[PDB]
Amino acid sequence: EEVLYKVRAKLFRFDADAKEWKERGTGDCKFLKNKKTNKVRILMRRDKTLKICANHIIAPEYTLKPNVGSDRSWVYACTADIAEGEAEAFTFAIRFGSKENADKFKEEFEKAQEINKK
Amino acid sequence: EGILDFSNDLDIALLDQVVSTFYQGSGVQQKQAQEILTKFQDNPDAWQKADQILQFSTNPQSKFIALSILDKLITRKWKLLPNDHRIGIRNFVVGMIISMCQDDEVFKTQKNLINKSDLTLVQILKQEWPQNWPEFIPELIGSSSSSVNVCENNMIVLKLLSEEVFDFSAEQMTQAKALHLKNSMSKEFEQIFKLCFQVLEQGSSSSLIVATLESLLRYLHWIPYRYIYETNILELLSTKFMTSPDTRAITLKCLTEVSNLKIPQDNDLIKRQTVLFFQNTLQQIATSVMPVTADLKATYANANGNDQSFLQDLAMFLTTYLARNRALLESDESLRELLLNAHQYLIQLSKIEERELFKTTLDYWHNLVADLFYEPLKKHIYEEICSQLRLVIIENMVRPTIQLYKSEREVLVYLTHLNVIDTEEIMISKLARQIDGSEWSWHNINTLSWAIGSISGTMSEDTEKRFVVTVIKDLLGLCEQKRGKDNKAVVASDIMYVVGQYPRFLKAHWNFLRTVILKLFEFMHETHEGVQDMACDTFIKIVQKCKYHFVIQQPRESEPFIQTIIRDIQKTTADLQPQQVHTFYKACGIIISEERSVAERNRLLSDLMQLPNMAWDTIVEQSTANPTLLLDSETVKIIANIIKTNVAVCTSMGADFYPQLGHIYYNMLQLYRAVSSMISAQVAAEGLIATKTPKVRGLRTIKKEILKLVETYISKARNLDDVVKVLVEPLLNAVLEDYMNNVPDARDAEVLNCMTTVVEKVGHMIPQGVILILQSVFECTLDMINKDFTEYPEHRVEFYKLLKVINEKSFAAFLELPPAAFKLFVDAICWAFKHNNRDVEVNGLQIALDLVKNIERMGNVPFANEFHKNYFFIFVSETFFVLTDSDHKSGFSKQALLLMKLISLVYDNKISVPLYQEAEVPQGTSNQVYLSQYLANMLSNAFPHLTSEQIASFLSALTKQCKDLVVFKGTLRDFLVQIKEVGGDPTDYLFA
Amino acid sequence: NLNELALKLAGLDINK
Amino acid sequence: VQFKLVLVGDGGTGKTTFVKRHLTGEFEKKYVATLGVEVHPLVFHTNRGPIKFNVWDTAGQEKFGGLRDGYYIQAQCAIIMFDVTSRVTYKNVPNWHRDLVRVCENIPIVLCGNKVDIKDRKVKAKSIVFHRKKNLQYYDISAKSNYNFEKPFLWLARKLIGDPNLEFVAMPALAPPEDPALAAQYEHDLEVAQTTALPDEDDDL
Numbered sequence A: 001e002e003v004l005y006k007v008r009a010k011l012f013r014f015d016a017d018a019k020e021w022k023e024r025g026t027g028d029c030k031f032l033k034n035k036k037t038n039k040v041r042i043l044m045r046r047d048k049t050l051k052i053c054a055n056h057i058i059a060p061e062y063t064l065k066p067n068v069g070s071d072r073s074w075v076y077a078c079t080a081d082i083a084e085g086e087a088e089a090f091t092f093a094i095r096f097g098s099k100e101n102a103d104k105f106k107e108e109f110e111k112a113q114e115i116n117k118k
Numbered sequence B: 001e002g003i004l005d006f007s008n009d010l011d012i013a014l015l016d017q018v019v020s021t022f023y024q025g026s027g028v029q030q031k032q033a034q035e036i037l038t039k040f041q042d043n044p045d046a047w048q049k050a051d052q053i054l055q056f057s058t059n060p061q062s063k064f065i066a067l068s069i070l071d072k073l074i075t076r077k078w079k080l081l082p083n084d085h086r087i088g089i090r091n092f093v094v095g096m097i098i099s100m101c102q103d104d105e106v107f108k109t110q111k112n113l114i115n116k117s118d119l120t121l122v123q124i125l126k127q128e129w130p131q132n133w134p135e136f137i138p139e140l141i142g143s144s145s146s147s148v149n150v151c152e153n154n155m156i157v158l159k160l161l162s163e164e165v166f167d168f169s170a171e172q173m174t175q176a177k178a179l180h181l182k183n184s185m186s187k188e189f190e191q192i193f194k195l196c197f198q199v200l201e202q203g204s205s206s207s208l209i210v211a212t213l214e215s216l217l218r219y220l221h222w223i224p225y226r227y228i229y230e231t232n233i234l235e236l237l238s239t240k241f242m243t244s245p246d247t248r249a250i251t252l253k254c255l256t257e258v259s260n261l262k263i264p265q266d267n268d269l270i271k272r273q274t275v276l277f278f279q280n281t282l283q284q285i286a287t288s289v290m291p292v293t294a295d296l297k298a299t300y301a302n303a304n305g306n307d308q309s310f311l312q313d314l315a316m317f318l319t320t321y322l323a324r325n326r327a328l329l330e331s332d333e334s335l336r337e338l339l340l341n342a343h344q345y346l347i348q349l350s351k352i353e354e355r356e357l358f359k360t361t362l363d364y365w366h367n368l369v370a371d372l373f374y375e376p377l378k379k380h381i382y383e384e385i386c387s388q389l390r391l392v393i394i395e396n397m398v399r400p401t402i403q404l405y406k407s408e409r410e411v412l413v414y415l416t417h418l419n420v421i422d423t424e425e426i427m428i429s430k431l432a433r434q435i436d437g438s439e440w441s442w443h444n445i446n447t448l449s450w451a452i453g454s455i456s457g458t459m460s461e462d463t464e465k466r467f468v469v470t471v472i473k474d475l476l477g478l479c480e481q482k483r484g485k486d487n488k489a490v491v492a493s494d495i496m497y498v499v500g501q502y503p504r505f506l507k508a509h510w511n512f513l514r515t516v517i518l519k520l521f522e523f524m525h526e527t528h529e530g531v532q533d534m535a536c537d538t539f540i541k542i543v544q545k546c547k548y549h550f551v552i553q554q555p556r557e558s559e560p561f562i563q564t565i566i567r568d569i570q571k572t573t574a575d576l577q578p579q580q581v582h583t584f585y586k587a588c589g590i591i592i593s594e595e596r597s598v599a600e601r602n603r604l605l606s607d608l609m610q611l612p613n614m615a616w617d618t619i620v621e622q623s624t625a626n627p628t629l630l631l632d633s634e635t636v637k638i639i640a641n642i643i644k645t646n647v648a649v650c651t652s653m654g655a656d657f658y659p660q661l662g663h664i665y666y667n668m669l670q671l672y673r674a675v676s677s678m679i680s681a682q683v684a685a686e687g688l689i690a691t692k693t694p695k696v697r698g699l700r701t702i703k704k705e706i707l708k709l710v711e712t713y714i715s716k717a718r719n720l721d722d723v724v725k726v727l728v729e730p731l732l733n734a735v736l737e738d739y740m741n742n743v744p745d746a747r748d749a750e751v752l753n754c755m756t757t758v759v760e761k762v763g764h765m766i767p768q769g770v771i772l773i774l775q776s777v778f779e780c781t782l783d784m785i786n787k788d789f790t791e792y793p794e795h796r797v798e799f800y801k802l803l804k805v806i807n808e809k810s811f812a813a814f815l816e817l818p819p820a821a822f823k824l825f826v827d828a829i830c831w832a833f834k835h836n837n838r839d840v841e842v843n844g845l846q847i848a849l850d851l852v853k854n855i856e857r858m859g860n861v862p863f864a865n866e867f868h869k870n871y872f873f874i875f876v877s878e879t880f881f882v883l884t885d886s887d888h889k890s891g892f893s894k895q896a897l898l899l900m901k902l903i904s905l906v907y908d909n910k911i912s913v914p915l916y917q918e919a920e921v922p923q924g925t926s927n928q929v930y931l932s933q934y935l936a937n938m939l940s941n942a943f944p945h946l947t948s949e950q951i952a953s954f955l956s957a958l959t960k961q962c963k964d965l966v967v968f969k970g971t972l973r974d975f976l977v978q979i980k981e982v983g984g985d986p987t988d989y990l991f992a
Numbered sequence C: 001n002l003n004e005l006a007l008k009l010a011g012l013d014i015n016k
Numbered sequence D: 001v002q003f004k005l006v007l008v009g010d011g012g013t014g015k016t017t018f019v020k021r022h023l024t025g026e027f028e029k030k031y032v033a034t035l036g037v038e039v040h041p042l043v044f045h046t047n048r049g050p051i052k053f054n055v056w057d058t059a060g061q062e063k064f065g066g067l068r069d070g071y072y073i074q075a076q077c078a079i080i081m082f083d084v085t086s087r088v089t090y091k092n093v094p095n096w097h098r099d100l101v102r103v104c105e106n107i108p109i110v111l112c113g114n115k116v117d118i119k120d121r122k123v124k125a126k127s128i129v130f131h132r133k134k135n136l137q138y139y140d141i142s143a144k145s146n147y148n149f150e151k152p153f154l155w156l157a158r159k160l161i162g163d164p165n166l167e168f169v170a171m172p173a174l175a176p177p178e179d180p181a182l183a184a185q186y187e188h189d190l191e192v193a194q195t196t197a198l199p200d201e202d203d204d205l
């Protein structure tokens, strides 16, 4: 795979039955373009333990929605994430160190969505 | 869930499987068996079935759980049992342990069960021995000669007994019970020691020897020294048992404790023995373990077998012995090699890569070099030790944990004083090996720079000058020779670190100091990560130490350099982040406060604050017409950054900041009001969720920074009259009503913190202001925090800090509360007692104590009389409740102190009125008699399992001891033990 | 004085 | 290749929060006391293959103690926890240690001082020396800031495997995969999620 984008981030998952955001991991979020399929995915590992907390393709259907409490975060529903086994469905929030990186992330997230439609 | 039914007979086969599902299962089946076993174990009658399990079960874990159920019974209800149950359990446990030692299969493969049985037996000995079991020790010694498994197991019983009596009794039994057991063990130890010493001398079972040595380790905590020095046991420990690795580990720990025995410091025969066992031990180590030249760093890193624990225990043994006894080895010439070999082992131990082990050896090195710095005719012994130590510490210098750094610096400074020349040579050599590349590394050059910077101020000024100049030249040469921005940034940062560490050098060479500063300014434009932060940190660091050379006009200059810094400040800081700009301004504030000509200082302050003041006037102009601009985030950030700049400068200038504070004060408070309106309007338009938005959080940052600025100045002000006359009145009008009338989620806890500072500094001067503070924040904040211990944690902590300082400085404010509000005050204090949160609990207990003292100082007046009538017993009983509920143990000392103050008030007749109702007790009854009756009834209902004799004896001692806190607290601790069991001896309270 | 030492420090450029 | 780990220490010291952080990555802000014990499997990927910890997260409050030292039987390693903002929790470390080694006489044990993220530290580093004579490894940790949060398991893994060069390694990342009858369902929970503010917005991440 090729590294298209790399940014430090904190990934949350929404616990709907508790009305609460739960952290899933902190570490490097990477945009990885497979070279023999050209598909781009999100791969994110926790610092130190290097366990996977995000592993899904940047689907062209996904839309980044802002959270009410943050100008440096995006919220989007994910239908197939395989970070912890079988492809589960999650409502993900991802927060960055600054509004600049969060805006850069949305640009890169949309560029990658164009790549995955071809 | 069948075994929980005590109607039927216990299914032992089902128990063994429920126990197996729990220990070896997983999933929901294990979780269900868990809740079942906890319920079976918690049934108060399960102890009656414990003899079935211990006899019939085939599952060792079931017999363990049975002994646990028994242990609960022996510990808390042993005295309530009929006297024949006590005999049967004791006989059964004694018999079962005898049987287990006879079956070598059981004794070899069921150590957990035998140990658990031995502890259960010890619990029985604590209840029954020796008053109802006087022949235990004689019969224990007799049966030890029968079997080797029994002799070894009796050493396990004696070890555990010594631990329960001497090592773990203080918290778990009363003072009288503990002393009784200590005296009983002490009276019969002579027989215990001879059995123990016979086994050590006669061999030969290693497991029996190890169990005997493990029990000896416990004895050494308390036995008289004659047992160690007037027998042959030191020779055995320091020779025989050091050779075999089975016994080596425990023998080393024993010798460590022997080095801690209380021992007559004048007998020369004992000094010989103390030297002799050390010499034997070091000989066995050199011949049986490893020679003094061995690479212990590599051995430890290999982590074979028990090597790491052994090297840890060796470091503990050497450092413990040498810190106490090295003077024995320093005068005799025949002991010189033994002294230096011991320290050479420590040198080798100090190279191990292990943080916690290094701190242990470093603490000893600190003890040594401090002694070589102060004691005559000593440093010459250790110069080759000290020379090696210099390299060890330089090469392990940590980033300045700062605690470890301060310890390393302290030792390295001592070592530099001891031999400056050797310290220079090592550091320059290390630098040479950075330059030739043999030891080049980012980590290595950084570590060396920290070490070089750490010894600043220990050489003579001229010797330091040539050292510093050499280091700077070499470091500059090292940078020139390196390639790439990554490598060059590392050296430049270290160059700046070193120069920042040598202010005496900078102060004597202005031209060089100015070059440094101008270079730091150059670096404030360097995009490379970390350089700007390093440039700013070095700048303020140098300023703090060399500020005077920035305020005066230096020879060959036309103006003080501070004027040059301010003039170019916009260009210098143009590329810095806001927090870096504030550090820069803070640094300039340090310099300006060095100017004590008031007129010149204020002019420097005006010039420094010129850019934030100009940006301030524009916003005050354009955001007042019209207040739409505050919706723009960019405008909110500019305002926050203007105020933060003012905080930074006020932080370093303190009292001198007042002219600049006056330039903005009135417009700032108006802005505070306007920002408060928009937060309120935004919560009205969008709901409570608005407080989470970036827009509102930015607005609240403005209010928080405004309060922090006012708080910063007032806490440091010298003219308190201006604070009272100019600052306090507009401040209260701006913040109090806005706080009171906002919804809970919109109230800034920083308002309470700001008010705490105001009351702390000028509270004694604004009694009406304190009353207005209480009226605006007391009842509405209390309602926020008095429904649970969780919500609004910041408000909770600041609330009681504010009440605490009001009670200290303006107690009259509480005297003017309506009776209903003063009752909420008492409630709020007791409410603070109940917090597990340490900040709340400590303040709540302190407020209660200061309040009772405030009431005492009033004398015999109606308010003091009514206070005691309404709240004395509330405070007595609320204090007892947290004392005895086992969930506020962190506040024991201050609970004990408050209670002693409450009790002593009555037994000193400092309460004039009677505390009772005139009908409920005969007239003329003293408060003392009524207090003991109230407390007796209270404790009888709160702890119904106590006898009336217990309660009476406890209270009799407690009231008689209310002038002796150490004794008073011991009596409380005895009460806290007796309420956990049934049948506590009431005579225990006669201990003192 | 250390005028030569100050000249080296002033020259220092981590970008060369 | 699984090992039994008993986690002991006073109530409120953060034993359960520490484990949850390792299990799911979350930080539980609420204190919900453990009743008896909660067993969780915990797997780490190392250069020596996966290592599995069966974490017996025991209860620190005495009224919830359950089987107490019964949980320690056949433990192969242990973590003793205390709170650097609560001196009583460090004062009790010798009590937890005494009960533990009476059952497990020769297991590797990590002593952890939790909650170092809090400014007002009460148990100072200079005061923490109990591990020395007992040969326990010590770490400052914070389950909230994740400071050193992997060190206790890394050190234990090295002791249990017998390899001092053991390291955690990145688990391999297989490719992720790629209906309208659930479009209105996911849109409903998305809208609730956007109206729930993310926690700890003042944090750096």
Ligand SMILES: Nc1nc2c(ncn2[C@@H]2O[C@H](COP(=O)(O)OP(=O)(O)NP(=O)(O)O)[C@@H](O)[C@H]2O)c(=O)[nH]1
Pocket: D009, D010, D011, D012, D013, D014, D015, D016, D017, D018, D028, D029, D030, D031, D032, D033, D034, D035, D058, D059, D060, D061, D114, D115, D116, D117, D118, D141, D142, D143, D144, D145
């Ligand atoms: N600031 C901070 N709080 C922490 C940290 N770790 C845990 N806590 C908090 O401390 C409280 C105790 O949580 P918990 O993990 O259940 O402690 P426990 O030792 O398992 N309790 P028990 O022994 O009764 O089961 C929680 O509110 C948690 O948020 C930490 O690292 N930092």
Ligand SMILES: [Mg+2]
Pocket: D015, D016, D017, D032, D033, D034, D058, D059
């Ligand atoms: Mg818990």
